[PDB]
């Protein structure tokens, strides 16, 4: 891997975020965006569960 190599010759850095199906705890997830709360109004909500 020389700096004068082409873009197919110079490497592509790889990580693998594999998801398998086993009876294991889901430990790492993506973020959950949460809005601001409103009070004293007839409103739908999405709480933590």
């Amino acid at each position: 891997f020389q700096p004068t190599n082409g873009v197919g010759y110079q490497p592509y850095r790889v990580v693998v975020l594999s998801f398998e199906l086993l009876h294991a705890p889901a430990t790492v997830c993506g973020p959950k965006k949460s809005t601001n709360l409103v009070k004293n109004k007839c409103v739908n909500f999405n709480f933590n569960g």
Partner: protein, 114 residues
């Protein structure tokens, strides 16, 4: 099926020139990328020159820029390497490389610059 053989080697002095060839079969050169590698005695194998599959862009190693020239022939299915302004550090056995399914490495031809 796929076989590479190298020819065009010889003995040259400092400042000479040579033209190596790598005859190819079992694959088209316009659909695959090729590389040239060399093996100095007592040193590891290092990349020399390469042509991409489209044939537009050719690349050379950092020690051999400005002096080497790699070329291909579509009809004869032979991969060439024109080498100029030769130093005695280029004493090596030259191999042509391709990745068609598996990797195929030729027998190589001894080129000594002295």
């Amino acid at each position: 099926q796929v076989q590479l053989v190298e020819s065009g080697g010889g003995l040259v002095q400092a400042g000479g020139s040579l033209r190596l060839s790598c005859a190819a079969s079992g694959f088209p050169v316009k659909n695959f990328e090729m590389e040239w590698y060399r093996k100095a005695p007592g040193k590891e194998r290092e990349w020399v020159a390469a042509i991409q599959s489209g044939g537009v862009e050719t690349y050379y190693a950092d020690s051999v820029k400005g002096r080497f020239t790699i070329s291909r022939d579509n009809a004869k299915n032979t991969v060439y390497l024109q080498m100029n302004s030769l130093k005695p550090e280029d004493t090596a056995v030259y191999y042509c490389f391709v990745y068609v399914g598996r990797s195929y490495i030729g027998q190589g031809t001894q080129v000594t610059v002295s």
